[PDB]
Paper text:
Here, we report that a critical glycine residue (Gly463) dominates the motion of threonyl-tRNA synthetase (ThrRS) and the sensitivity of the enzyme to antibiotics. The natural product Obafluorin (OB) is a potent inhibitor of bacterial threonyl-tRNA synthetase (ThrRS). Our previous work showed that OB covalently binds to ThrRS, forming an ester bond with a tyrosine residue in the catalytic center via the highly strained β-lactone ring, making OB the first covalent aaRS inhibitor with demonstrated crystal structures. The binding of OB induces a large conformational change in ThrRS.
To test this speculation, we constructed an EcThrRS_G463A mutant. The TSA experiments showed that OB increased the Tm of EcThrRS_G463A by 19.5 °C, which was 14.0 °C less than that of the WT and 1.3 °C less than the Tm of EcThrRS_G463A increased by 36j. In addition, ATP hydrolysis experiments showed that OB had no inhibitory effect on EcThrRS_G463A, indicating that EcThrRS_G463A is also resistant to OB. In contrast, the conformation of EcThrRS_G463A cannot be further opened, and in this binding mode, OB can be competed out by ATP. Consistent with this assumption, when EcThrRS_G463A was cocrystallized in the presence of both OB and ATP, only ATP was resolved in the pocket. The frequency curve of EcThrRS_G463A had only one peak at a DR-A of approximately 14 Å, which was close to and slightly larger than that of EcThrRS_G463S. This finding suggests that the pocket of EcThrRS_G463A cannot be extended so that its DR-A reaches 17 Å and can be effectively suppressed by OB. Furthermore, by comparing the FEL nadir conformation in the computational simulation and the real crystal structures, we found that the FEL nadir conformation of EcThrRS_WT was closer to the open state crystal structure, while the FEL nadir conformations of EcThrRS_G463S and EcThrRS_G463A were more similar to the apo state crystal structures. These analyses suggest that the G463S and G463A mutations affect the conformational space of the ThrRS structure and cannot expose the active site for OB entry and reaction with Tyr462.
Numbering used by the authors:
A (entry chain A): 242 to 642
B (entry chain B): 242 to 640
Write the structure that this text describes.
């Protein structure tokens, strides 16, 4: 039930000591990564988010300006070029503020929702690294919302709604919500922190979401609402987060022209719904015990013959399924049908199609699932249509399940 | 027709001195980036490529083994962690070999085509930086093909076929091909370079490709076929490259079990079709002067109302076009309709849909293009199908 064990079994990824905390995504694991990206992008379109891409490294002087250098130095990778030192970004907020600062912004541009699948690199202590859940290089489903003070309630509510919307796709039953308050090392006045912490609490209360306080776990610039998911050992892992920030836009000279034609500093909301793709995939691997939902499965269908007599038929079906958009593979090895079924069941392939002379002649397929069920024979076109519905709807359950 | 000027006008990207040679991709520019990713992925499924993702940095000992540290040192970004050096990867080849080395490989696994949109970082001299053409951080449509010696001809032929297949989508008329031979500083024996250079020369001639030699411009590990495209002032930019490598797999302990059950070292072919996304987007921007083809346009359709009376009707169409897979925006601002049209025309939006009272009553829409062509009232579903066909076929011209 360990995601590291399942990851090796399904050939999802590997790690080596030439790059501690750095993930080598194999073809099958990268497929899950990219499917989550498509799923997130469908939500970004629905909730009207921009998607951008910031540079990997920026000058150290900018990270000093944000207060990151003083409160985050130990976790930052640095490099140099031409007598100038750069920081590999551990966060995407300063890059998004730089994009916001291009061109004059007015209140008609707010709220401005700017998302990124941003690569973050943090020099986490090597003793704390754990599989995919704690790594040194990860990709956040990050976004930053620039808005007025009057828009805070609506935008924070939208982030909370998005969290439960996207978590419901995976059928999570245990979602623990925490409000992380000010840490010992922080910027911003006590009055600002009181307003920011109260705003997040009111938003949670308004949505009728029970939560507990997590004292001192907030960011150095803003408090956090934390959505916690649990692994196989029931250990708590922070995945969802929404942050209410009154300080960083001022530090980076972000401003917009208000209704009064007076210059105003926008409020910034930081949020990551999945958290990081690496940690969320690890949580998904242990939650499903490798039985990924069909829309997430690296290989959705395996088609396989009894002898050569059905080998040509299998190849035609694999091409037909592939043209229909289904991740399908052919297993034409000289092995017993039970041998093939057991191997691909270990690979957690959702559906295995068995082809004898009976099916070759009838144009049908014998259907078997990774759960050991025998679904019998039904027509190829019916199988295609049901699989497409299961994939497009991102259904959690298989056929007749 | 300078891409830096067009990129500023169209809000595609920006660059700052706090991050020299590093691109801030804005929403509209990142849309073009992602569309090229979709285009490349569609082709790579056709040619049966894996897609992987290597990590950002690896131990400097790795780059010593490949010879990169001796032949590529000054152009590499380096960092530190717990008394160890790490190299920000300037290439994706060592990472792909590491994935190849996971698990036993046999001849039945070859040719193994392993692709990645690999982020590369190179410390290019700051005086050589130029817009999107030459940057310090870029993404290559990279891949490495592990194959046998007998499979070299077919695999290199497939790489060349891929280059002209994907380039024909953009209608490039001038594609200049060069064969770069052994540099001064290189690894591998002379005999291997003789064979590798001859193999690439034979492939170019067999493919009816006229080419010129570029002596000493090959990689320190392999010769390379270079596909050259030209910017607005006809400056030569290397985008496509095919590299034949007989040395790196051995240095990185790559091997497979042959048909004879003997350990054998695979041949590696390095290839990038577009080159880098940053440089190719720059080429496209100057080639089209900001008039991106509809499948590439950041915003394909803008629907505007003349007054408030049609504001609802515009919203329903915007949802209906968006549900059809079209990047569409509604312009309901309190501005004159002529003001709205001019703004989106200057943004090179391919199609602009104007909705008056007669459009609402008839369920139609008035269509005009960024080139000033007026297409009159057209049925809404006729708009969508024609738009879908234009995006589907990746057509160069508006129908
Ligand atoms: N080292 C890491 N490895 C994997 N995911 C991480 C790591 N650090 C942070 N994340 C993810 O990024 C999200 C947002 O980052 P944030 O800065 O809020 O994390 P925090 O340092 O754990 O607090 C987290 O909710 C988590 O899912
Ligand atoms: N500094 C750079 N900026 C942008 N693109 C680059 C840069 N260096 C290389 N490329 C692209 O990467 C491709 C392959 O990289 P290579 O090492 O052969 O040079 C080139 O054909 C070119 O398109
Ligand atoms: Zn942030
Ligand atoms: Zn390479």
């Amino acid at each position: 039930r360990d995601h590291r064990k399942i990851g090796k079994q399904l050939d999802l990824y590997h790690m080596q000591e030439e790059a501690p905390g750095m993930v080598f995504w194999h073809n099958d694991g990268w497929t899950i990564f990219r499917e989550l990206e498509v799923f997130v992008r469908s939500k970004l379109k629905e909730y009207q988010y921009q998607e951008v891409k910031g540079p990997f490294m920026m000058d150290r002087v900018l990270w000093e300006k944000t207060g990151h250098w003083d409160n985050y130095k130990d976790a930052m990778f640095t490099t140099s070029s031409e007598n100038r030192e750069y920081c590999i970004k551990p966060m995407n907020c300063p890059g998004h503020v730089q994009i916001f600062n291009q061109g004059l912004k007015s209140y008609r541009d707010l709220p401005l929702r700017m998302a990124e699948f941003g690569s973050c690199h943090r020099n986490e202590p090597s003793g704390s690294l754990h599989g995919l859940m704690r790594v040194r290089g990860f990709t956040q489903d990050d976004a930053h919302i620039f808005c007025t003070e009057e828009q805070i309630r609506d935008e924070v509510n939208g982030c909370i709604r998005l969290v439960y919307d996207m978590y419901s796709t995976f059928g999570f039953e245990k979602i623990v919500v925490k409000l992380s308050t000010r840490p010992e090392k922080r910027i911003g006045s006590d009055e600002m922190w009181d307003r920011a912490e109260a705003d997040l609490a009111v938003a949670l209360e308004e949505n009728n979401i029970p939560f507990e306080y997590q004292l001192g776990e907030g960011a150095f610039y803003a408090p956090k609402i934390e959505f916690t998911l649990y692994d196989c050992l029931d250990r708590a892992w922070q995945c969802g987060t929404v942050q209410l920030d009154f300080s960083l836009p001022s530090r980076l000279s972000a401003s917009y022209v208000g209704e009064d034609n007076e210059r105003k500093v926008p409020v910034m909301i930081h949020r990551a719904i999945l958290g990081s793709m690496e940690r969320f995939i690890g949580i998904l691997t242990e939650e499903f015990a490798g039985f990924f939902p069909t829309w997430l499965a690296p290989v959705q269908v395996v088609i396989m013959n009894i002898t050569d007599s059905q080998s040509e038929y299998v190849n035609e079906l694999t091409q037909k399924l592939s043209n229909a958009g289904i991740r399908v593979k052919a297993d034409l090895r000289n092995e017993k049908i039970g041998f093939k079924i057991r191997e691909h069941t270990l690979r957690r392939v959702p559906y295995m199609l068995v082809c004898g002379d009976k099916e070759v002649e009838s144009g049908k397929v014998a259907v078997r699932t990774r759960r050991g069920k025998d679904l019998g024979s039904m027509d190829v076109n019916e199988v295609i249509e049901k699989l497409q519905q299961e994939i497009r709807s991102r259904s959690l359950k298989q056929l007749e399940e």
